């Protein structure tokens, strides 16, 4: 099976799309799913090699049942909202998910073009964030972001799904949060209080040691091990996102993995806490204000 | 004189601010405006040599009578509506202007935080646009824009005030317009008909002989020759910008004079039209939802402020 | 496993292409210059990398190859078929060797050939070379892009790259060579829509005609072939403009490669003589075929036991 | 006075046109002249910053008369031909040169296409050629090519008209000439020989000193000194071109100059020689089979027509 | 299964090698820093990508492996072997660890090698710290190019990684690293003609010379070997300059990479104790070895698992 | 009007420092060598051009002018001043030629510092040699931007080139080299906020500290010096790291220039001795001189007419 680009070249611009399917409307959007390839290459040909454009299409669990009948990936059920004591993950609609990249903002835009004028009158857009990364693969909060990311086989064996589940083998499980950051409060501490908070230096990137590092930073909570001792990998590819004038300053999370028990173990980690950690602090810097879950099938399905 | 950085090399992402001065906020405007060649560099000497930042910034004519006391530059008002037969050209508010430039957008983006955070409070936004040049040059109508802008010598003669206005040697003028496009009438045109609204060939960008290119093309309307039989010239630097969930799909315009009056003539043409054209073309498929006029001092007129 | 040439090879915006026959007596001087043409490739352009991005693939004929080589055959390995049809005519012309030369500049090109061509120096004939150029956008002499739907991959590989099929061959490939001659006249009295309708795609944006919109005698139309079990049959491109404007020849330069010879030859006979539903490829009315010819390019070791 | 883009930047292709005026032609060249710094900005503007694309148009002596009426370039007229002893610069037909650089060689291929369909039934070809630098700045004879050009303010100075000729100031001339190579008598010598014909070092591009350089070297030969002492130069752009099948390869000499005096004394040492040298030792494998002159008006002049 | 280091490179411009010696009672401490390695990788280089192609191979010596690990030893590990010529000598000289570090730029080999010394302060001694960079065209400070003939994808693997010969080890490879020191004065002193009899390639355009022509004590001649079966037996180079112009010091830093150290044993010993035709390698004339290590290089897999 | 050597180059990643002193009968090797090394560095460069940027910033010492030249000297041309502070200590160390060579690569550098010590052997002794190179984001070895407030265009021209105070030598410059090494451990224990209030600036963003925060013994408030008519006296900066990690070395090679070396003298007795407000800049905490050389840099005429 061939998958959609999941395992993206880095790019320092993305469009994340995420719109509703209105009733009446699944013909018209079957029909984009069979041409979203070939829009792909029409828009991105003429600019390579230095245009990196791709587009992964997502569809969410109460859109698949209207849309196809026979089988259902195995892990596909809509976004779990999660109450915490003070954080909460809120889940919000959506039953396609376009995510476009590209090494600049111009060629994503072409190809949301394309694709929203083919679904005109069959959806409702939902979000549209424009992202754009720092020249330094810096986020918002000015930290490096991405440099943990898995590459190669350890990639392929983290984000793709296998003989588990072989009808979709080559497929994936996206989740985005939009996030919005409250900017005064973090500049208001020390580059140590921050490096507490996420669990690496801020210069230079290294990993605070394990006899430093605090219980509720984020590297400490978003590492999970598996049976065997072996570490549960995702891959990430978070875009910071913002307008000056309405103080609106985010980063937008999209987490890929094999299955979404991954994701959903780390999420719970951070919203609900451990034994030894009441939350990620990253939160009380960070809101969430979307949640939505999708797969990814494999781009042979989609042909079909 | 040293000019503010008003001829840029080419750049594929701006950012466009403009602001309201809120009552009392005066003094805080000031001190911003005596730093802002040091925040330049702060954000963009880092990333030098391929991040290519540069902030102009412009002041209405309203907002210079509150901010500094004594001289005027001679061609410094309000921006005027045009009320034409079918098409306006409306005035909306504007005391400050900043028009950031860079390769990258994030470049853009650092810089205008920097200087939003030293105006909080004694500013109002009135408009935020996030442009992006297409890979070709091209705008949202899919025309090459920018070809027929004056280079070197030619252009520092249209676009930096000189002896005829010599404390305020070494600024420029700017106009600018937000412009909304109604895409689906637009395609329903065949290229060629496409063609007789711009004046230029689509793919190629090749002007229409004189044979053919109508009255009320936009290159026709848009070419002025003064009373020596020299032409009238302005910079533009237009972004295309917009959003495809609301199908917004836009054009802003903004160009550079030495005195507004050139801009004024081209603007005036366009919408009330002339003897042989009732308007320029381009306008029933573009419309203007803000236009506003700055004055963009020299470099050294806003490091000697207080 | 056997190691390909590099058919499959990364853009390259700049080629030569070089068809030569072989002279009575020169046999063993071709055999040793195909022993050695892989470490030619190396020493021009090594120091080049990894902008210079130089290749070449060799390709042998079928009367050819039965002169030079003992033992078995290629099994798709035969002469170019003529195509005699109502109107338009597919000419075969002779041609024992070619040398498609590859690189981001014409330079690197033409320092290979010099090379390769010193060494036969009385053993070959010069028959065709070509010097071609692609333009920025990826666009050819009509003005569309060309190369879009090329495969790429693992697709690119099963498509073109002989396997267990033929198993003392497997690595290999089939190149067939045309070089037209636009009537670019006649192509430019054409609207930009009826241009459309000859290819089957948008000129600007390169999006296909959708299904119920595309001509049957469109390009994209007829080189759209499926297999017995309903397979999309693939060639792999890299077509290059070339041209003297003294002379006024505007041209493309085909090259096509494939596993077995039958899929680029099922093409051109849609193309030349029609089917049920279309005469001809509109492509011909403004496209005519002044060369023609079938090659094998062996795996690279291949070569290099010789 | 705004000149034509004389001093361009490093372009790495390039496109020489030639052609003579035809009978009645004279109409639809004005015509053009009038549109070309329009047709570079139309074919350029859309691949900068990275195409570099520009157009030197130059017109020769007798197209001048034909062309224009009233004054003429004080230094204009046909290319003078120069029989030697041993080797020939010869004259041939030319009324309009196109010089057209690139970073690469679509771009002046589409230019002159569109220059060459307004041209067409007013115009006869001469040549055409197609030019590509290699990729360390080397000539066809293996040596960087270009190095002791004059930059900046000491290039204008040697280029553009001035003061002396006021009504065409920003102007300049160029003397081209196709020169073909004997490549296999070229390798033959050593290493060191052919830098002994040069009159620099072939690797490292490093000038040979005066007690080693011979008196017959290339370098010897085009170095000129003024009354006062001061150096004359000129700016070259030289391009290779060939094709292998023909075993054609070629050097296409292009030098500017505010006079074509200094250009034509270069000539006339590497032609005829001097008390010290008999010729050029470069001409012992260098044939010349065209030479023309031209003057390459101020980019105004041409806007005005 | 096993993933290996970065052994095969794209190409980089800029290197830093370090040979250390680890101090008695250190081996704790180096254990600590084998098992971060990989992550300090990534954070002095994840937000320099995708352009600085940061990479770090860590090897370790044979009497290092058994202070630092029970069990196994890889079947071809033990210490560099001294070879006594007639004329030349190739010397061995201490080193327990090597850090190749390559880049597209120098600071980025610096940083990764500061991080990894201060984790190492304390537990090692250096012996060696070379700063490699490129010439723009490839060449070497003989001025002749230098990497040509290296082999690439499938044959590079073949020829560089430990296979099933030794399963535990698989992943791995076997560096060997000597200094070099040049006799510039005397090399400058020959003719090209002359330099290019001691290397058997044209100086210019790298074209190998013919096998009748080419002297049998060429550097080229000498470092070709057939093994067995009569199969090239191929290693992967990396050679930096380095150099000092104040103290004379232009020197030629050699690693060479194989699949069994036998490899590139073979080929010193025929360049420095020569054969029946050749007294030794040419080459050697104007170059002297002042250091002489081996290592290996595990799988990637190998020193996390630490 | 004389032509100044390129004092004002573009940015630059790489240099070398070559520092050497004139032996006894070395005057008339030098004098031709000066004559000689603009032709040298075209040379060098051309082949490498655009991207190569290659200069060479030739000085000369004022016990080295008597020995070369007679008749007038520069007005400001002595041995650099030694300053002895209560704790830090300006040293002057010798230096009749200093040789300041920049490129985007280090290869080109070498090359023409090769050239030009190949021509004045045996007539000098080298002194320092230092290769430097730039951080990816201009920072130095203390984590710091570095250069951001230095001059550009008319501003940097006026700063650095000598005028009609001094009409024979107009077109010249003063340089001033300090060799600094930094004690890292000891910076690396304070707080990011506290190595703020060292430099000036804040660490990741390069924004200047406010006026009201900025210690009087920090680096920017003691090198910031106004003149009696309130003018801004500047210098121009190229400071470049260097070091090597096995033995811990790290390091700024400071260079400056500017029109009168009253300027750069003025701003070092305010670092090393003080003023009312402050006892010494506290860089100079983590920061120990090693070198101090001045040198003038003549007009590139001068150095041809020789
Ligand atoms: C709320 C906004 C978020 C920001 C700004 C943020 C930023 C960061 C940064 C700076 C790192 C360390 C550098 C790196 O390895 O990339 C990191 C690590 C990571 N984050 Fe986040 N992140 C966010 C949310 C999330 C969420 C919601 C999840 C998971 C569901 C997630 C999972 C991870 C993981 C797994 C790592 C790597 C831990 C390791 O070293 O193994 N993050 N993130
Ligand atoms: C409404 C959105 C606008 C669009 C999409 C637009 C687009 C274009 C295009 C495609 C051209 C041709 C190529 C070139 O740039 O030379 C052009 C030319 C020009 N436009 Fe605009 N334009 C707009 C508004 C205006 C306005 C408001 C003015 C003046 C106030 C203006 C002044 C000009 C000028 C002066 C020319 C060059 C004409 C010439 O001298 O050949 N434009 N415009
Ligand atoms: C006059 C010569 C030619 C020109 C100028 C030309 C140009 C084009 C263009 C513009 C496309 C559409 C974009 C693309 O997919 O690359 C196309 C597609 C194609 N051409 Fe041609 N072509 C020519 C000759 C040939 C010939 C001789 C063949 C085959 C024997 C060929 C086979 C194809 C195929 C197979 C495709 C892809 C159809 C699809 O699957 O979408 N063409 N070519
Ligand atoms: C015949 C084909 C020619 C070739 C292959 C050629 C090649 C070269 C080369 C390699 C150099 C040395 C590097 C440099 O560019 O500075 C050079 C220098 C020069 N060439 Fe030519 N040249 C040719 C014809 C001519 C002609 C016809 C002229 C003038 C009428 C000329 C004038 C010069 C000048 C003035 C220099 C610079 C000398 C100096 O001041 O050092 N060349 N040529
Ligand atoms: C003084 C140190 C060295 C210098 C400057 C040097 C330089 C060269 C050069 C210029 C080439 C020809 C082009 C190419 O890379 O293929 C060459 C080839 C080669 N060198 Fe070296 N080398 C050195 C040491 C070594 C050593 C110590 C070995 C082996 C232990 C070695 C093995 C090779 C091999 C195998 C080739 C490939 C030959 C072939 O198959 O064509 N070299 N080297």
């Keep these: 099976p061939e998958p959609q680009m999941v395992l993206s070249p880095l790019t320092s611009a993305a469009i994340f799309l995420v719109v509703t399917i209105d009733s009446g409307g699944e013909d018209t959007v079957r029909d984009l799913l069979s041409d ?24 969410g669990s109460e859109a698949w049942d209207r849309l196809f009948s026979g089988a259902r990936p195995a892990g596909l059920h809509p976004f779990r909202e999660l109450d915490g004591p003070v954080h909460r993950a809120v889940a919000t609609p959506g039953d396609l998910l376009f995510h476009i990249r590209a090494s600049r903002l111009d060629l994503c ?26 020249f330094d693969e810096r986020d918002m909060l000015g930290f490096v972001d991405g440099t943990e990311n898995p590459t190669g086989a350890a990639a392929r064996r983290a984000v793709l799904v296998g003989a588990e589940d072989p009808a979709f083998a080559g497929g994936s499980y996206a989740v985005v949060q939009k996030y919005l950051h409250d900017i005064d409060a973090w500049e208001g501490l020390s580059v140590e209080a921050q490096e507490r908070v996420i669990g690496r230096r801020k210069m230079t990137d290294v990993e605070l040691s394990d006899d430093v590092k605090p219980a509720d930073s984020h590297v400490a909570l978003t590492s999970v091990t598996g049976p065997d001792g072996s570490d549960l990998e995702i891959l990430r ?35 609900l806490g451990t034994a030894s950690a009441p939350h990620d602090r990253i939160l009380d810097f960070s809101t969430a204000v979307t ?14």
């Design 237 to 271: 590819d978070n875009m910071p996102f913002g307008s000056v004038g309405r103080e609106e300053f985010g980063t937008y999370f999209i987490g890929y993995a094999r299955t979404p028990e991954v994701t959903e173990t780390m999420l719970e980690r951070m919203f």
């Design 36 to 59: 979203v390839a070939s829009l792909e290459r029409a828009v991105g040909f003429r600019a390579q090699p230095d245009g990196r454009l791709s587009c992964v299409t997502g569809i």
């Design 109 to 134: 835009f072409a190809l949301a073009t394309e694709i929203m004028g083919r679904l005109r009158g069959a959806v409702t857009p939902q979000d549209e964030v424009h992202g754009f990364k720092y």
């Design 291 to 304: 949640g939505s879950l999708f797969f990814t099938p494999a781009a042979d399905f989609l042909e079909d």
